[PDB]
Amino acid sequence: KTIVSTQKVLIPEGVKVAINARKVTVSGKYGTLRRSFRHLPIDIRLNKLKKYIKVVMWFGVPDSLACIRTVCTHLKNMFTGVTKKFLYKMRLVHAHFPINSNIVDNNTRIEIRNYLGEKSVRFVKALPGVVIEKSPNVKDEIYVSGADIENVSLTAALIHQSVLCRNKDIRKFLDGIYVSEVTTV
């Protein structure tokens, strides 16, 4: 039982943070993210004058410490999102049949069509507040982006799932739509 264990998360420059009872809310250039931590025991305290926020845990086994670290990481991610959107660059790879990747509904909902040539539509709606753009630069790829690292990632995963082919040898058929690069803007 380690009496005190701490962690220091440096808030960036153009970020309006506001925790209360582990209900952290961060605002900035891109989006206002709110994400509660009221399932682990933790007195996350804010310093507004200086930068940084301190996550601190009294007692608790290594589990608690781990949780604290996780929390800190999450906070960092949130901060990053609000400063600069997360940009999951998803390249679609095909063998024979080119995948038709039609974005609709204000760059939410990406209709995927002609995956291994089946003439049937795969709908994959994005989570709350996460734009799905297609390539300006290269030909194939798809940018998924929008502040909450969790949500964009989730969206990407969903997209991937929507593609992945069923009863065949998956080592042979490499066709699909995969996360190339996790980045920021």
Binding site: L40, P41, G60, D63, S64
Partner: protein
């Protein structure tokens, strides 16, 4: 348990412990209105609880299931069942005790306006370490086919506004009373006033 009728606000309580507390009181001889039984908690994870309840559901009577374990799945009814489990309900006394218990979902027509007590021996806050999985009973019930959860929530929300309104008025009244006391401490006698001051009032 010397009151006529205790209303128990079941929110934030641990099912079993709460039930146990109720049962003894009932036996002793004490009407108990367990109110707001949607918000009772169980100490397992949600999934675990569901599994247990699923298992329970599975045990019907093979021959003719009209008889045999009735799977009452309103949260209030679950609570009632639990309470019964801890009573000698096959006697007369036990039966009487059982009858004495009323349970409700949300809070209705007298039990809005009654004082709501709390059993702190059976409070989730005091009885589970915060790194443990718990589960809201209402959610569990919903998962196992109760349906009237959202409606109940809505009703509760509606009630809360009313309560708030009432509370404001109450607060105002209290303030007024305080003011009067302040005014009318000066107008009594000296010695009496002094005495009053000495004993708190």
């Amino acid at each position: 348990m010397y009151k006529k009728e205790y209303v128990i606000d079941c929110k934030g309580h641990l099912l079993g412990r709460l039930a146990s507390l109720i049962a003894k009181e009932l036996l002793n001889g004490q009407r108990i209105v367990a109110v707001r039984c949607e918000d009772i908690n169980i100490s397992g994870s949600l999934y675990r609880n569901k599994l247990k309840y699923q298992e329970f559901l599975r045990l019907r009577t093979n021959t003719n299931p009209k008889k045999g374990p009735l799977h009452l799945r309103e949260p209030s009814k679950i609570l009632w069942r639990c309470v019964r489990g801890m009573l000698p309900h096959k006697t007369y006394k036990g039966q009487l005790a059982l009858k004495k218990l009323k349970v409700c979902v949300g809070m209705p027509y007298p039990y809005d306006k009654k004082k709501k007590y709390v059993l702190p021996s059976a409070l989730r806050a005091f009885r589970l370490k915060k790194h443990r999985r718990y589960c809201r009973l209402g959610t569990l019930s919903s998962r196992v086919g109760w349906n009237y959860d959202t409606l109940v929530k809505k009703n509760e929300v509606l009630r809360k506004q009313v309560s708030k309104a009432y509370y404001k008025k109450k607060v105002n009244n209290l303030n007024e009373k305080k003011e009067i006391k302040t005014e009318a401490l000066n107008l009594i006698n000296p010695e009496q006033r002094q005495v009053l001051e000495n004993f708190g009032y």
